[PDB]
Amino acid sequence: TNHNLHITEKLEVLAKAYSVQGDKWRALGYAKAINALKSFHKPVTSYQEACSIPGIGKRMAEKIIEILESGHLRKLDHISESVPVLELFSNIWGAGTKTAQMWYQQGFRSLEDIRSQASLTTQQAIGLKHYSDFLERMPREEATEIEQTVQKAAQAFNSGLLCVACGSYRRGKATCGDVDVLITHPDGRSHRGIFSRLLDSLRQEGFLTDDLVSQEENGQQQKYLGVCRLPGPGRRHRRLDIIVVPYSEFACALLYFTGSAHFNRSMRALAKTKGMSLSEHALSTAVVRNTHGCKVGPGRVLPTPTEKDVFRLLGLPYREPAERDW
DNA sequence: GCCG
DNA sequence: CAGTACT
DNA sequence: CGGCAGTACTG
Ligand code: NA
Ligand code: NA
């Protein structure tokens, strides 16, 4: 790179401020500008040069050269005093901008205030109980041990079940925020009813410690978001996210769960410009949308046995998981 | 915020 | 439904 | 002007 650390650091402060106050589109713009600056080959030195970069318009350019010439951004000095507290609250799993702003308006300023006085959803109480742990990253070797724990439990009652760790893990990062386990079966019918068996097996060995999202009274459950802990000393609580998909959806589910988030959004954006649509379920062609870009007609699912097919069908060069950070 |  | 979450 | 991804739970 990063050849603009002085600049991006200041913009990031402003970006998170907008995000936590709920201004998600302004925050999105800052995010793309900030990445474009982190990615640039040289220090940006001119107004004209700032505008040349994709994701940076006249307004963001002005902020850049103000930092360049003065070493400060005046906008930073006029950020609401609530933003630090809002960010503190919003880092509780299950609480977002709306809840953080409510708690603030209700007078709360600390996690102690929240713990003792605030109304917490079941998820938010769990998030609060694990507040520090949910902000830590684990070494990728620990993600391997968690994936193996889920895989052995799954394969124990169906040996044909395929399990793979996705997200930051599959993208080759040294550390992982959580573990993303995708599960499928190559026959095409077996994946039906496996969450109940898997979750009970993982509970019985004491591996799962809390559940955040888990609809298991239905049968069509798609995801489990919860908390686990490996046995022995020195272990922390880790976020575990599992999805079970039909085999025909494997490549699209793999692509989605591997990410990154920005990479997915970017890929789905491109698909829409081509009258196509990409989700975690499928790549579809002939999608009918109105002038507001909303799906009003279904389209048809395209066969996508591998990730490479999805890229291919979108007219895109393949990109290996480690190359999908942005 | 950016951009078509 | 709005809010929050997943990548 | 207006879209900025497309989904899955919770209550
Ligand atoms: Na949160
Ligand atoms: Na992850």
Closest CA to A7 of A43, A48, A47, A46: A43
Residue whose structure tokens are 């124990």: A156
Q: Are A275 and A285 in contact (CB under 8 A)?
A: yes
**Is the bond leading into A264 cis (omega within 30 degrees of zero)?**
no
Comparing every residue's Cα with the C1' atom of nucleotide D9, the nearest one is: A213
Pick A260-326's CATH classification: 3.30.210.10, 3.90.550.10, 3.40.50.300, 3.30.1360.120: 3.30.210.10
For residue A179, what are the CA distances in angstroms to A142, A241, A278? 9, 6, 23
Q: Residues 6 or more apart from A251 whose CB is under 8 A from it?
A: A304, A305, A306, A307, A309, A310
- Number of C-beta neighbours around residue A276 at 10 A: 18
Which residues does residue A243 pair with via DSSP β-bridges, in sequence order? A182, A223
Task: Render A15-32 in DSSP notation, one character per residue.
Answer: HHHHHHTT-HHHHHHHHH
What ranges in A56-191 are assigned the alpha helix state H? 58-70, 83-90, 97-105, 111-117, 122-129, 140-157, 167-170
* A272 Cβ contact partners less than 8 Å away, ≥ 6 residues apart: A287, A289, A293
How far does the centroid of ligand 1 lie from the alpha carbon of residue A90, in Å? 4
Q: How far is CA A223 from CA A16, A22, A79, A85, A142, in A?
A: 28, 26, 38, 31, 21
Compute φ and ψ for A301, nearest 5 degrees: -70, 135
Q: Do the first three CATH levels of A1-82 and A260-326 match, i.e. the same topology?
A: no
DSSP letter for each residue of A175-236: EESSEEEEEE-TTSSTTTTHHHHHHHHHHHTT-EEEEEE--TTTS---EEEEEE--SSTT--
**Which residues have CB under 8 Å from A72's CB, separation 6+?**
A10, A66
Cα dihedral sign, A147-A148-A154-A159: positive
Q: How far apart are CA A258 and CA A164, in angstroms?
A: 10
Contacts of A234 (CB under 8 A, 6+ apart): none
Percent helix, strand, coil in chain A, to 5, is 50, 15, 35
Q: Ligand 1 centroid to A207 CA: how many Å?
A: 24
Method by which the coordinates were obtained = X-ray
- Centre of ligand 1 to C-alpha A89, Å, is 7
The active-site residue, picked from A24, A63, A152, A223, is A63
- Say if CB A175 and CB A138 are below 8 A apart: yes
To the query of whether residue A63 is one of the catalytic residues in this protein, the response is yes
Integer Cα distance of A294 and A151 in angstroms: 39
Distance A223 CA to D8 C1' (A): 7
What is the CA A225 to C1' B3 distance in angstroms?
Answer: 36
Sheet holding A283-285, edge to edge: A277-278, A283-285, A300-302
Protein-to-nucleotide distance from the CA of A70 to the C1' of C6, whole angstroms: 40
For strand B, which nucleotides have at least one atom less than 7 Å from a protein CB?
Answer: 1-3
Say how far apart CA A176 and CA A169 lie, in whole Å: 6
User: In a 3-state reduction of DSSP, which class is residue A250?
Assistant: helix
**Nearest-CA neighbor of A165 among A185, A186, A144?**
A144
Query: What's the CATH number of domain A137-259, 1.10.10.10, 3.30.460.10, 3.40.50.300, 3.90.1150.150?
Result: 3.30.460.10
The CATH number of A1-82, from 3.40.640.10, 3.40.50.300, 1.25.40.340, 1.10.150.110, is 1.10.150.110
CA atoms within 13 A on the CB side of A85: 19
To the question of whether residue A137 is assigned a binding role by annotation, the answer is yes
Cβ count within 10 A of residue A248 = 16
Q: What is the resolution of this structure in A?
A: 2.0
Distance A170 CA to C7 C1' (A): 12
- Number of Cβ within a 10 Å radius of residue A265: 12
Please name which ligand lies nearest the alpha carbon of A126. Answer: 1
Give the residue extent of every domain in chain A: 1-82, 83-136, 137-259, 260-326
Quick check: A226 and A211 in contact, CB under 8 A? Answer: yes
**Bases in strand D with any atom closer than 7 Å to a protein CB:** 2-11
Note whether A219 and A131 are within 8 A (CB): no
Q: Name which of A94, A90, A92 is nearest A213 in CA terms.
A: A94
A169 annotated as ligand-binding: yes
Residue A260: cis peptide before it, omega within 30 degrees of 0: yes
Which residue, among A151, A180, A148, A150, has the nearest Cα to A261 in the 3D structure? A180
**Residue A269 beta carbon within 7 A of nucleic strand D:** yes
A178 marked among binding-site residues: yes
Separation CA A245–CA A184 (nearest Å): 5
Contacting residues 239-278/A vs strand B (CB within 7 A): none
Q: State the architecture of A83-136 in CATH terms.
A: Orthogonal Bundle (1.10)
Residue that the structure tokens 């052995």 belong to: A152
Cα→Cα distances A68→A7, A54, A64, A88, A195, Å: 7, 19, 6, 30, 54
> What is the distance in angstroms measured between the alpha-carbon CA of A23 and the sugar C1' of C2?
16
For residues A36 and A88, what is the distance between their CA atoms, to the nearest angstrom?
27
Q: Is A239 part of any known ligand binding site?
A: no
Q: H or E segment at A48?
A: helix A47-52
| Residue A149 tokens, joined | 């724990």
